[PDB]
């Protein structure tokens, strides 16, 4: 019964604020806690009673409350602040908020497209593998094309994950029958990132 924004973006040095709103009927909302969590890892308590912070937590994190709405403010945004943030009051938790820190210059993706191997076609299967890497930020739109027609069915795209060099990578797979692959002139993996597009094409030849 706690509502948080889906995401909040900022650039280093700025101050951002994440809200946590309870229902109108909520009598215990004065003991709000805030947590930082790298996805897949244990949360870390940041603020635990509107504004109290444990020992070892940066003073750049501060909490406040105005009626039914609590707020976590991050002063002097740093790249290390890029994580998920959760609020809770008693057993009730918010949905979580993804925080993005735009701390790198824009970087165009490199796209590599592999056709189905003949060894997979012999098994009467066919997979097109599109690998996207070294782009920043991590918001790409991947679109597949059969000849020039958009393809919706059979596509599976991962969410962009960070690499060692702080840039993102992702992979998109197009599953099709061998007859679908051999009956078209070509297939294309179209990657659009920050208004620019990189397109790779393969043909059953």
């Amino acid at each position: 019964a706690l509502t948080q924004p889906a995401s909040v973006s900022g650039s280093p040095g700025q101050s951002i604020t994440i809200s946590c709103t309870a229902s109108s009927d909520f009598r215990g909302f004065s003991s709000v806690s805030w947590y930082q969590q790298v996805p897949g890892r244990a949360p870390k308590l940041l603020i635990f009673s509107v504004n109290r912070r444990p020992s070892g937590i940066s003073h750049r994190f501060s909490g406040s409350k105005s009626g039914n709405t609590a707020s976590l403010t991050i002063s002097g945004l740093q790249i290390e602040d890029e994580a998920d943030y959760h609020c809770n009051a008693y057993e009730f938790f918010g949905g979580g908020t993804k925080v993005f820190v735009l701390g790198q210059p824009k970087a165009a993706p490199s796209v590599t497209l592999f056709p189905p191997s003949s060894e997979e076609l012999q098994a009467n299967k066919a997979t097109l593998v599109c690998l996207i890497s070294d782009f920043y930020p991590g918001a790409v739109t991947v679109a597949w094309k059969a000849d020039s027609s958009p393809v919706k069915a059979g596509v599976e795209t991962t969410t962009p994950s960070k690499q060692s060099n702080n840039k993102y990578a992702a992979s998109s797979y197009l599953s099709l029958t061998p007859e679908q692959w051999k009956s078209h002139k070509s297939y294309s993996c179209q990657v659009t990132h920050e208004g620019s597009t990189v397109e790779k094409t393969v043909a059953p030849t």
Partner: protein, 221 residues
């Protein structure tokens, strides 16, 4: 000094059971309840219940009553969460947690998390297909070749090249989850394009859950 250590990841079929332990240390075990929470994929945290080491009292959210049993062994300061008759939507990252000394529902101490995957899929070794290099995968002085590690379950697989002798240029991408419940990933290595006719390239795929190891030679085609 305060530590909460949970047991390892689990993979189950709908209708099976699972026991997750939480070994506590660094404080007096009977002074704090041990809470249990879970995080579904792409979702927030969800409180499940707690167990009281002193006396063994428990409390549960409604949707877990009748399927979740929380206990403790106070001689070894370990709490247990028994989840029976699992459903597919019980797939989550499970946490045990302890409140801070303020005891104001501020979870200052968390276990490292336990992955519980509930899927109707069964263990399956991967099919390894070569991603052969061609003129449409070369970038001047370098060429991209790889291996398609297709339709395995569950995670993970590890991929190396030439028995670990090939390190630079290797990029193993995170796996994708097909709608069939099976996983697939790709592993590509950037190599000098002049070496395509002389150097042998072999990806070594290891899938411990199925006890399967595949060595796939990749050559230009």
């Amino acid at each position: 000094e305060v530590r909460l250590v949970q047991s390892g990841a689990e993979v189950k079929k709908p209708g099976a059971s699972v026991r997750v332990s939480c070994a506590a240390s660094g404080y007096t075990f009977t002074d704090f309840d041990i809470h249990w929470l879970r995080q579904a994929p792409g979702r927030g945290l969800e409180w499940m219940g707690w167990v009281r080491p002193l006396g063994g009292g428990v409390s549960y959210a409604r949707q877990f009553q009748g399927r979740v049993t929380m206990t403790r062994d106070f001689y070894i300061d370990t709490a247990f969460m028994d989840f029976r008759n699992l459903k597919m939507d019980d797939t989550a990252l499970y946490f045990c947690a302890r409140m801070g000394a303020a005891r104001e529902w501020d979870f200052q101490y968390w276990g490292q998390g336990t992955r519980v995957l509930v899927s109707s899929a069964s263990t399956k070794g991967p099919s390894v297909f070569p991603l052969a290099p061609s003129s449409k995968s070369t970038s001047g002085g370098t060429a991209a070749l790889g291996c398609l590690v297709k339709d395995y379950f569950p995670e993970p697989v590890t991929v190396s090249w030439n028995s670990g002798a090939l390190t630079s240029g290797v990029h193993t991408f995170p796996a994708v989850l097909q709608s069939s419940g099976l996983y697939s990933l790709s592993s590509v290595v950037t190599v000098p394009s002049s070496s395509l006719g002389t150097q042998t390239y072999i990806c070594n795929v290891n899938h411990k859950p199925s006890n399967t190891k595949v060595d796939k030679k990749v050559e230009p085609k």
